[PDB]
């Protein structure tokens, strides 16, 4: 088929790259952790020597890395990664500040490459199932070329707008999630503190004007949804530290546009409190513990 | 059928009492505004001389009044309204502080009456259509007697818990609504300020982990949903002043249980800012104006 | 001299009433705790049978009680305490909601009594030293009669305004204190986290535009002021639970005037978090622990 | 004496550089605005062709510029300004993110230069009078050389710590100022809304545990201090836009250390609201208008 280079085999990168393999693409892979690489090699990937080595046969490069100033330093620094090229389609799927995505976008153009920012939403579970949503900034042209690849890794594919718009949509969405999650945790705790059964209150609000994604699919009160992180001591799911990061990127976007974000900013302050408390690697619904005394 | 006394023919009271009439009940009605009374009389109600006069033939008394310390002073003050009685089923459907609802509940019991607190959620539109949700505190017994009446005025009927639990569920739900509404308005403004089309961003978040009731049915950005208050300059809908009231009741419940409500409390501060600005009678999604400079 | 009745011998009441004794007044005292009464009796007070019994010889009644709806229920309920009277000067020095103080004020007038609300600021230490500040609402006349008594218990005496104005000044002042205290704790933690020595940062801010009462006299960072609660594990001082109460009264005043209090409301949310954590009886500067990971 | 190069003759730069002249130093000056340069030339400065030209005879370079990523791009970009040097003492007195100050500090060291970050606090008025406070990060050695220059432009000189510590102290201090200023404005509005005279409430709080810098010297309520910006419609003073900038830098420092700043972050959200409202160039105490309906 097409030769894909996949850089970044972490929590999200590994199952996303594995899904490309199951779809029948040939992948050269690179990650900093050897065992992450070996996992992909066992499933039919070839291992590359490095990021630069990987892209050196590829029709398309897909990155998925954990840090905002890891990603930019990788692509931009004047000694690869963009310096090594074709033109090849680039799909940059990390979550990074929109400003930083535009900066990479422009350098990619200045060089003749079709690039998309296509950050992703959904779980480690979405990544594994291939049901991720992509939020895509860039040229319609480049989105058309990338489509079959997004369809292999994901389900909803939104063209959010021009360069950087995928990151903008992503940071707005995740900031709103944080707000609705704290809103939900505080509402649950208030009701229960005032004599209500958690499951009765959850159902009422879910089905009414308080309704939201957390209440549909991710209730922060232990025992309400038995398959949610709250019912297994907030293990797994989506780390509070990652939510705090995402909120931090949203602040950067707000400074850039002078947008007021009183709920998001407060959400971020509360996430930082969770970090002081040692909860960086708990699922982000652990915010429940701020409000629930009997935990 | 059964003789109902209906006290309070305001925004919600009038269409609720009219719906009882359409269902075939006989109503004696009272309100402080003569034209509100005449509206009900034109539709087949009999006019009562007062609140006390009204209940003086009734199988059931349903109140629906605008103020928390109007309601309690009416029922409790030692010269009616509870002093005048049967036993008769009482449905108190105003939104009032849970503490205040328990106080009325206990006085009702101390006297032999079956009472429910059954505050309501849905619009002036829900009230008119008979699709309101009721959130009901009290004895299962009394809920069973009241059921056909709730079914005439509404659609979802939740037994939230014992005495006062309907108010608790109501204030938790509306506080959560306020949080998701400000969250949504601030997210929309952030995205648009960073180059996104409002309708594209709205669809992405609605369909993703930022998803919520406001995004499904009540988008705060003008032009996104043409039938929403935002698309007609925030006229009608659900007044900001009423949202500020509801948030205020939620604070009272929080003080009573020592519950921390950082998002709700902040929501209330922002609603109060809207009030200083003259927006008390705009739809509560007018909170959008705090964030959107081009309004 | 004059016969004083003193109701309430708690943390503040005991040393305040003791100071009146040292000034040479005759006191009849009552409190719910026998040992609090015995303390005053050892210092030269006579013990009264109750609140009603106490006022039954008095030129002036001074109360100082812990709860807002203890105080009002005591004076108003229609069976003493205001029902038993002269006219006698009443000094009500508890901290209670302004609305509640006006209610008591009016009942006192409706009966011929000169009453002041004169809530107090300063420590258990201020109370003991007789250096308290009084914040006084009521008639200039009544303030003139009370003056020598305030001078015995305190130092700064402010006439804040008419009936209830002492409570208004008190709740505004304490809400502002809470804001500056959290502001200070968060600033100290930010500086230290970014490599600064706590005492160097404290001195800079104290002497600059960040300067405030907490920095002058009550630094929340352990070791900065060796005589402050922070340097002895937040024992003693002014309980977080009492600060949360005061903030709660300030919210009630805000609802009454539709005033927006985003900083105070947030301060209250953070105090409530401290309560969930078990810190109700620590000094209110324990808020430092929210921000300082190494505590 | 010593030859000084002064880069940046804005609001603060002009009077600071003028004060050096009055102290008897020889200055070569550069700024982007010709009239700012001419002002200094009229007072005895020589005009330089540019930033690079200016430093090309100098014993010491002092910069004072408005933007955080103006300053760094000027000194670092690989074509001056640090590339042009001696070693010469560098005093970088802009307010910029601590991270950015360390970055410049390290490049300066990597090259043999003694550099201090010495951001400044005080007014356009402090700058003119020579009463500024300096908050200084860097080697004690370099502080000793710079001392007579700081003494010419300022009064309190604090050694905040090592490289970047001046910026850290500055951003903590100004964030705390913003919190106490909003705290003060909201407290004043609450008191006045509840029947108090603004000047009576101001005096009580200033002299009590609510006491702070704003209340001593910069009251946000019009008419309270006749010489404050509030008494002349918030013209002049210290622009809200600059306060919003400073708060933004404080957020960057918080992200860098994972510090929770709930009051500062909220302060920033409220400042951004002021910006949407058109108040960017009003004195930052204009935040009063959020709370005071009769303005």
From Swiss-Prot, chains A, B, C, D:
Gene3D superfamilies: N-(1-d-carboxylethyl)-l-norvaline Dehydrogenase, domain 2 (1.10.1040.10), NAD(P)-binding Rossmann-like Domain (3.40.50.720). Changing residue 174 to A: Strongly reduced activity. Pathway: Amino-acid degradation. Signal peptide: none annotated. Keywords: Branched-chain amino acid catabolism, NAD, Nucleotide-binding, Oxidoreductase. NAD-dependent L-serine dehydrogenase that catalyzes the oxidation of L-serine and methyl-L-serine and is possibly involved in serine catabolism. Has low activity toward beta-hydroxyisobutyrate. This is NAD-dependent L-serine dehydrogenase. It comes from Pseudomonas aeruginosa (strain ATCC 15692 / DSM 22644 / CIP 104116 / JCM 14847 / LMG 12228 / 1C / PRS 101 / PAO1).
């Amino acid at each position: 088929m097409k030769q894909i280079a996949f850089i970044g085999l972490g929590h999200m990168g590994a199952p996303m790259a594995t899904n490309l393999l199951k779809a029948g693409y040939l992948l050269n892979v690179f990650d900093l952790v050897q065992s992450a690489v070996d996992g992909l090699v066992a499933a039919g990937a070839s291992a590359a020597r490095s990021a630069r080595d990987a892209v050196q046969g590829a029709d398309v490069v897909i990155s998925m890395l954990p840090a905002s100033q890891h990603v930019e330093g990788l692509y931009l620094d004047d000694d690869g990664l963009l310096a090594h090229i074709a033109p090849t389609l680039v799909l940059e799927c990390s979550t990074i500040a929109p400003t930083s995505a535009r900066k990479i976008h422009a350098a990619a153009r200045e060089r003749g490459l079709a690039m998309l920012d296509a950050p992703v939403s959904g779980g480690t579970a979405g990544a594994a199932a291939g049901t991720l949503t992509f939020m895509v900034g860039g040229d319609a042209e480049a989105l058309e070329k990338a489509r079959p690849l997004f369809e292999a890794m994901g389900r909803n594919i939104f063209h959010a707008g021009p360069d950087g718009a995928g990151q903008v949509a992503k940071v707005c969405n995740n900031q709103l999630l944080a707000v609705l999650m704290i809103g939900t945790a505080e509402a649950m705790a208030l009701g229960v503190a005032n004599g209500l059964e958690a499951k009765v209150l959850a159902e009422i609000m879910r089905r009414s004007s308080g309704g939201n994604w957390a209440l549909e699919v991710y209730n922060p009160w232990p025992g309400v949804m038995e398959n949610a992180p709250a019912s297994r001591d907030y293990s797994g799911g989506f780390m509070a530290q990652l939510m705090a990061k995402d909120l931090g990127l949203a602040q950067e976007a707000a400074q850039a546009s002078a947008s007021s974000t009183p709920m998001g900013s407060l959400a971020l302050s509360l996430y930082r409190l969770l970090l002081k408390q040692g909860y960086a690697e708990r699922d982000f619904s652990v915010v429940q513990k701020l409000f629930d005394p009997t935990q």
